[PDB]
Amino acid sequence: DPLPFFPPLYLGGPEITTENCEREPIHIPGSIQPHGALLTADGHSGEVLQMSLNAATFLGQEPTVLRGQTLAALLPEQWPALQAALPPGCPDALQYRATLDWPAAGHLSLTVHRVGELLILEFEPTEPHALRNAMFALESAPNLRALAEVATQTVRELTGFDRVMLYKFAPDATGEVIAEARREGLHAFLGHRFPASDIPAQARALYTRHLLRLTADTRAAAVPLDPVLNPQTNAPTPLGGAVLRATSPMHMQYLRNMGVGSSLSVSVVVGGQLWGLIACHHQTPYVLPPDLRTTLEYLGRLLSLQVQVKEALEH
Amino acid sequence: PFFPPLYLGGPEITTENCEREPIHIPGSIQPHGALLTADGHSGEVLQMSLNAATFLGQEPTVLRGQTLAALLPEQWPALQAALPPGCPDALQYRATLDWPAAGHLSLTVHRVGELLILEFEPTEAPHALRNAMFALESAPNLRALAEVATQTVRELTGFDRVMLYKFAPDATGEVIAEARREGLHAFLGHRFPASDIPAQARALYTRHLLRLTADTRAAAVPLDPVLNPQTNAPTPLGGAVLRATSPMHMQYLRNMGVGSSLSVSVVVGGQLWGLIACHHQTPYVLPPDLRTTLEYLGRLLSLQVQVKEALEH
Numbered sequence: 001d002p003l004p005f006f007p008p009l010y011l012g013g014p015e016i017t018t019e020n021c022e023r024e025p026i027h028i029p030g031s032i033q034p035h036g037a038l039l040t041a042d043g044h045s046g047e048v049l050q051m052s053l054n055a056a057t058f059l060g061q062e063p064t065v066l067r068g069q070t071l072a073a074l075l076p077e078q079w080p081a082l083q084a085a086l087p088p089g090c091p092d093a094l095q096y097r098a099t100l101d102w103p104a105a106g107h108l109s110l111t112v113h114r115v116g117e118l119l120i121l122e123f124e125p126t127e128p129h130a131l132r133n134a135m136f137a138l139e140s141a142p143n144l145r146a147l148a149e150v151a152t153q154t155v156r157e158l159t160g161f162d163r164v165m166l167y168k169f170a171p172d173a174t175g176e177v178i179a180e181a182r183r184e185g186l187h188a189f190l191g192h193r194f195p196a197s198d199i200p201a202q203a204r205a206l207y208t209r210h211l212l213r214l215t216a217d218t219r220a221a222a223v224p225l226d227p228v229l230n231p232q233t234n235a236p237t238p239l240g241g242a243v244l245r246a247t248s249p250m251h252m253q254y255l256r257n258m259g260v261g262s263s264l265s266v267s268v269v270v271g272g273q274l275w276g277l278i279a280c281h282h283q284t285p286y287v288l289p290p291d292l293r294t295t296l297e298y299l300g301r302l303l304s305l306q307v308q309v310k311e312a313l314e315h
Numbered sequence: 316p317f318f319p320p321l322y323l324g325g326p327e328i329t330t331e332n333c334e335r336e337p338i339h340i341p342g343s344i345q346p347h348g349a350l351l352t353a354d355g356h357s358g359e360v361l362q363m364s365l366n367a368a369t370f371l372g373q374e375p376t377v378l379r380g381q382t383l384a385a386l387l388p389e390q391w392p393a394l395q396a397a398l399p400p401g402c403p404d405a406l407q408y409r410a411t412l413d414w415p416a417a418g419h420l421s422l423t424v425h426r427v428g429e430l431l432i433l434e435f436e437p438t439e440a441p442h443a444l445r446n447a448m449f450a451l452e453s454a455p456n457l458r459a460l461a462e463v464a465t466q467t468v469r470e471l472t473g474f475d476r477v478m479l480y481k482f483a484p485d486a487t488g489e490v491i492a493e494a495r496r497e498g499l500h501a502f503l504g505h506r507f508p509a510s511d512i513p514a515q516a517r518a519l520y521t522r523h524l525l526r527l528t529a530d531t532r533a534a535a536v537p538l539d540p541v542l543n544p545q546t547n548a549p550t551p552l553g554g555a556v557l558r559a560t561s562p563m564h565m566q567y568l569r570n571m572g573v574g575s576s577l578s579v580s581v582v583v584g585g586q587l588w589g590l591i592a593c594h595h596q597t598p599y600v601l602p603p604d605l606r607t608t609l610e611y612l613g614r615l616l617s618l619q620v621q622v623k624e625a626l627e628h
């Protein structure tokens with residue numbers, strides 16, 4: 001039965017069990033994963049409102065100094081570019097990316113998107129023809145099976161992940177591993193099927209709009225935003241568009257129970273519906289840098305197109 | 316059918332037989348790169364472009380005996396695996412060579428039956444592609460998508476004019492969006508007949524998705540031999556981007572005052588929906604890595620055109 005979200009934990013909401021699976025508000029956890037930092041800022045003035053508690057250590061500045069400046073002063077070269085790329089009223093799915101040379105922290109990748117009157121800024125550390133070669137190989141795959149196999153093998157070669165699966169949704173939202181590339185010694189999940197609440201309904205809707213999400217370390221504690229609520233609204237900060245957002249502890253426990261230290265996936269979206277997932281597992285924690293993740297994002301789109309094409313060749 | 320090519324004493328092309336020109340077998344290439352053909356098994360260099368000596372820095376005869384194994388040691392096994400016998404002519408493999416005579420070359424290979432076609436071009440060596448991809452996806456409708464696409468391509472390439480050209484059901488064309496330098500005519504809104512991109516050219520554009528004329532006044536460079544030794548027949552160059560451009564089509568770029576051109580096919584439901592069409596007033600060799608960006612954009616636009624057309628119908 002579909003039911004509306006519970007309030008999050010920090011607003012006195014209940015804790016999450018196998019009973020109320022589908023009512024965790026996973027998009028507003030009030031916290032992020034510790035391998036990057038996040039700031040929120042007023043979309044018109046550029047006043048800095050919220051920051052992750054670890055921000056001082058990524059950005060090399062005291063909180064009170066950060067919060068006491070506008071983005072115009074903090075990001076003089078990027079602030080006008082942000083404002084042109086992310087105009088008021090734009091969708092929350094639109095992202096702008098730049099690379100910064102920050103004194104204390106080396107090269108940072110900056111990813112920005114806009115939710116209403118809020119700008120959300122994510123900072124992460126950042127670092128030949130493999131993509132072009134893959135694009136052509138995907139297109140020349142003769143059928144859906146060969147496409148799925150080429151796609152899994154390519155992603156594994158690009159990333160070094162211990163396990164890469166193509167996970168397809170059935171009409172009842174059960175899923176099934178239809179191809180996989182895996183490290184020697186791992187057991188096969190190929191052909192296994194798994195029940196529909198394994199990826200509950202409120203996450204499949206979010207996976208149709210925001211096409212990539214990851215857990216870099218399934219044992220890492222989440223880092224709170226400070227303050228936790230958006231001071232504009234005294235309400236929760238929407239983080240469904242932020243790859244840094246903390247992952248639910250109900251999902252983190254499952255990966256732990258499977259022996260997974262790191263988990264990523266790209267959505268494959270066909271005709272406006274979530275067709276499947278390029279799912280990746282690593283047994284140890286593992287951070288895939290932003291520019292490599294971009295390659296996977298591009299492959300997500302290519303695969304969406306090629307899945308349509310291969311399936312049309314099939315009636 | 317097709318007329319024989321000129322160099323096999325076929326008729327010269329007119330505006331009376333626009334549909335029968337063998338645009339795929341001209342026997343020559345554009346001079347900003349070099350092409351070798353080679354045997355699929357032996358790696359034996361069978362044809363070369365008369366200009367190969369320039370790019371490769373090799374005494375002419377040296378090449379036309381040697382083997383790819385010898386000539387490209389690191390690459391030759393990769394090719395063997397990347398382009399297995401029986402693969403499609405559409406499948407391409409690329410690498411960057413740090414080659415003694417020329418700082419860096421791009422190498423592009425595909426296979427047509429028993430022949431490997433190798434293309435060499437000068438090359439080199441950020442977020443504009445990722446930023447463009449998200450911009451295309453958030454365009455609210457087909458019109459805005461067209462506008463974003465043309466603007467994005469112009470910004471990435473510096474081309475004097477970038478259009479989105481859309482085919483009607485009878486192959487009548489229509490510039491539905493345009494991004495252009497100040498002080499050019501505006502082709503926005505105009506339509507042009509179905510003969511302006513003939514039938515056999517649209518068929519090839521359905522399979523091989525990117526083509527360009529780098530300099531509309533440059534002479535083609537012959538293949539030597541012109542005929543493939545294997546077959547004593549013309550080498551199919553349809554999948555080569557260095558392939559010499561129809562003289563009928565450069566005469567039309569010249570009459571328009573264009574010195575450089577490039578298009579990307581937008582393919583939807585197995586059919587040619589339209590092209591991203593770029594103009595430059597002067598000669599312009601777009602480097603391979605930037606062309607790759609446009610090739611990606613072509614696929615992304617193909618996806619988004621279907622998405623956007625579905626939310627009208």
Ligand SMILES: *C/C=C1/C(=C/c2[nH]c(/C=C3[NH+]=C(/C=C4\NC(=O)C(C=C)=C4C)C(C)=C\3CCC(=O)O)c(CCC(=O)O)c2C)NC(=O)[C@H]1C
Pocket residue numbers: 017018019020021022024026165175177189194197198199200203213214215246247248250251254263264265277279280
């Ligand atoms: C009572 C709640 C439950 C629950 C919560 C939950 N699950 C997800 C997301 C995922 N669950 C997946 C399950 C699988 N992992 C595998 O490896 C396989 C098969 C080989 C299956 C069936 C997967 C793949 C996901 C997607 C995440 C990813 O791939 O990286 C969420 C959403 C997480 C978020 O947005 O933060 C939630 C809340 N899962 C359950 O099984 C029940 C106990």
Ligand SMILES: *C/C=C1/C(=C/c2[nH]c(/C=C3[NH+]=C(/C=C4\NC(=O)C(C=C)=C4C)C(C)=C\3CCC(=O)O)c(CCC(=O)O)c2C)NC(=O)[C@H]1C
Pocket residue numbers: 329330331332333336338488490502507508510511512513516526527528559560561563564567576577578592
């Ligand atoms: C007697 C035949 C004619 C002919 C031949 C021809 N045309 C092409 C390909 C193209 N023709 C195009 C025509 C236009 N260029 C424009 O800028 C506009 C409108 C603003 C039109 C209508 C275009 C765009 C192409 C695509 C090629 C490209 O974009 O670079 C070919 C094939 C060339 C090849 O494969 O190398 C041929 C043989 N064109 C005519 O107009 C008639 C007279």
